[PDB]
Amino acid sequence: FLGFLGAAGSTMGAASMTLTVQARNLLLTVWGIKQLQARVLAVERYLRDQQLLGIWGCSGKLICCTNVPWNSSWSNRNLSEIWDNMTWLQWDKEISNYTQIIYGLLEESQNQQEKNEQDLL
C-alpha cells in the first residue's frame, strides 16, 4: 500500500497498522568521521528506544498493552475522537506535556509486576 510515513496524515486507528513500515526505516578522513558519526548516532537512538520498551515490559512488541490507567487530565477525549478523528501528529502535540509522567508510571508498574511474578514462583 503506502510506504514510509504514508500514513502520517491518516487517523490514529488507520495508522498503527503500518508500524513495521516505520520501524524498518530506523535501522578524506574528515568526511569519513562525518559518516561514522551519523551511523553511530542512528544506532544509539535505536537502542535507547529499545531499552525503554524493555524496562516497561514491552520488549519485542510493536503494540504493548500495559497495566497503567489513563488519567483523564492528560486528555479528556473518547476513543472515537482519538482513534477515528485525530492523526498521530496531532496527538503527539496534545499530550506532549504529559509524556514524562506517563513514562515514569510505566516504569514503576513494571517494577511492581516483575517482583510479584518472582514471589509467585
Partner: protein, 432 residues
C-alpha cells in the same frame, strides 16, 4: 488503558548531518555514496507542513561542504611561491583590437630551475588584473604577493559542477514541498517524503543564477522580508534565457619546470589576433523575461508603481560584475547592458578574465588558474536573478550577490529535514 505503540508516523524539526551521494573532480569524487538508481518519493495525503527557506540549515551545510572539498583539491598541488618576483613587463601590441589595448602584459622574470644552482629567464603573458605596478616603470609584481601564498590548481582536476544528491541518515527524513507557487515560508499542502534531494549542481556565480531549476508555472519572487531593503530578492524564472559566452583567443600553453618534480603552466604566445571575451544574451528573450519579472514585482510594490532597473553599485570586481567559471577560466562580465530600463539582434556583455582567484570571501588562500589552450565557448541557461532594492512612486532594482549561500538557498528551498520519533502512547480499552 495506556497502550504503547512503536513505529508511529511522527516527526519533529531537526538538524543533522546529511551525506552526499552521486551517480578528478574538484568536489565530489570517491568520498560520496553511489546513488539509488530507483529512488523513492512518497506522497503524504492530508499533511500540511511549515517550511522556512531562510532558516534552512541544509544551506549552511552545503556551503561548508563545498568549501572544504575545494580546499582538499588544492592541498596536493604545486605551490607557486618562486613566482612571486619582480617582473619586467611590456605591452602586448601585436594585432590588438582597440578594446583591449593595455589588457595583456608580456612579462619576463628569473625563475628557478630543477637544480638549486641555476636560474632561468622565462616569460609569460598576464592579464592586467593579475599584476601590480611597483616603483622602473616596467616593474610589476603579482597582485597577491603582499597578501597571500598562491598555489596552482592541478590541471587534471576539473571544475565541472557535477550534481550532488543529499541523503538523510536513518531515523531522519527529508520532506519536500510540491506546492506550486510556494514562496519559501509558511505552511504548504502537498508534501512528499524523499530519500534524497535531486541532484544539485554546485555552480558558482554572482548576479545571475546559471544552470539551475525553473519555476513550474510563473516567475517567482522570494525574499526574507520583502519590505526590508537590506535583504536580497531571489527571482526564479519559469523559462531559461540562453547565454553564450566566449574567449576568442587561440592561447597556447607552456610548461616551465621550477623544481624537482614541479612545473608552472604559463600562458604562451597567442595564435591569431587579440579579441575581447564576451557574452551574448538574446534581446527579445531577455525583454520578455524581464517583462514577467516586473509583472510579479508589482504584486508587492503596487501596479501603478514605476519599476526601474539599474546596474550595479560600486564595490570590488567580484561583486559588481557577473562572475562565473566556464571552460576552466574565470570571467567577470559587465551586466549593465541587461539592467538598464524603466519598467520592462542580441545584447553583448564585455568580459574580463583573471588568472589569480580569491575564492568566496577568504583572504590568504589564492589560487592560480592554469591557462586553457585553444578557444573557449560556453552555453548556459540563466534561470534566475539576485536583486537588491534601492530604496516614493518608484523602486530601483539592482543586481546583487557575493554571498554564495544565496545560490544554494534557491535550490534547497523545497527541502526540510525532520527527525522520526517512533514511540507514542494513547488510551485504549485494554489491560495487560
Amino acid at each position: 488503558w495506556v497502550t504503547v505503540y512503536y513505529g508511529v508516523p511522527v516527526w519533529k524539526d531537526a538538524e543533522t548531518t546529511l551525506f552526499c551521494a552521486s551517480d578528478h573532480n574538484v568536489w565530489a569524487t570517491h568520498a560520496c555514496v553511489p546513488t539509488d538508481p530507483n529512488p523513492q518519493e512518497i506522497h503524504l495525503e492530508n499533511v500540511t507542513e511549515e517550511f522556512n527557506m531562510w532558516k534552512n540549515n541544509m544551506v549552511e551545510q552545503m556551503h561548508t561542504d563545498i568549501i572544504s572539498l575545494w580546499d582538499q583539491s588544492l592541498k596536493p598541488c604545486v605551490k607557486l611561491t618562486p613566482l612571486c618576483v619582480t617582473l619586467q613587463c611590456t605591452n602586448v601590441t601585436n594585432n590588438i583590437t582597440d578594446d583591449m589595448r593595455g589588457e595583456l602584459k608580456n612579462c619576463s622574470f628569473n625563475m628557478t630551475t630543477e637544480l638549486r644552482d641555476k636560474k632561468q629567464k622565462v616569460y609569460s603573458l598576464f592579464y592586467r588584473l593579475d599584476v601590480v605596478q611597483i616603483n622602473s616603470n616596467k616593474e610589476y609584481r603579482l597582485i597577491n604577493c603582499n597578501t597571500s601564498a598562491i598555489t596552482q590548481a592541478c590541471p587534471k582536476v576539473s571544475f565541472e559542477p557535477i550534481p550532488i544528491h543529499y541523503c538523510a541518515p536513518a531515523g531522519f527524513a527529508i520532506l519536500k514541498c510540491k506546492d506550486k507557487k510556494f514562496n519559501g515560508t509558511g505552511p504548504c499542502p502537498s508534501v512528499s517524503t524523499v530519500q534524497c534531494t535531486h541532484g544539485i549542481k554546485p555552480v558558482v556565480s554572482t548576479q545571475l543564477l546559471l544552470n539551475g531549476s525553473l519555476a513550474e508555472e510563473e516567475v517567482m519572487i522570494r525574499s526574507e522580508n520583502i519590505t526590508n531593503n537590506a535583504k536580497n530578492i531571489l527571482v526564479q524564472f519559469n523559462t531559461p534565457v540562453q547565454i553564450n559566452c566566449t574567449r576568442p583567443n587561440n592561447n597556447t600553453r607552456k610548461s616551465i619546470r621550477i623544481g624537482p618534480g614541479q612545473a608552472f603552466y604559463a600562458t604562451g604566445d597567442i595564435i591569431g589576433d587579440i579579441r575581447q571575451a564576451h557574452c551574448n544574451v538574446s534581446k527579445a528573450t531577455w525583454n520578455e523575461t524581464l517583462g514577467k519579472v516586473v509583472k510579479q514585482l508589482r504584486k508587492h510594490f503596487g501596479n501603478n508603481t514605476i519599476i526601474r532597473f539599474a546596474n550595479s553599485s560600486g564595490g570590488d570586481l567580484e561583486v559588481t560584475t557577473h562572475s562565473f567559471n566556464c571552460g576552466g577560466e574565470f570571467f567577470y562580465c559587465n551586466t549593465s547592458g541587461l539592467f538598464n530600463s524603466t519598467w520592462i539582434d542580441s545584447i553583448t556583455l564585455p568580459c574580463r578574465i583573471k588568472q589569480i582567484i580569491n575564492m568566496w570571501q577568504r583572504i590568504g588562500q589564492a589560487m592560480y588558474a592554469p591557462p586553457i589552450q585553444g578557444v573557449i565557448r560556453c552555453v548556459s541557461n540563466i534561470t534566475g536573478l539576485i536583486l537588491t532594492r534601492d530604496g516614493s512612486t518608484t523602486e530601483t532594482f539592482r543586481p546583487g550577490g557575493g554571498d554564495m549561500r544565496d545560490n544554494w538557498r534557491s535550490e534547497l528551498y523545497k527541502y526540510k529535514v525532520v527527525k522520526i520519533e517512533p514511540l507514542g502512547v494513547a488510551p485504549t480499552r485494554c489491560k495487560r
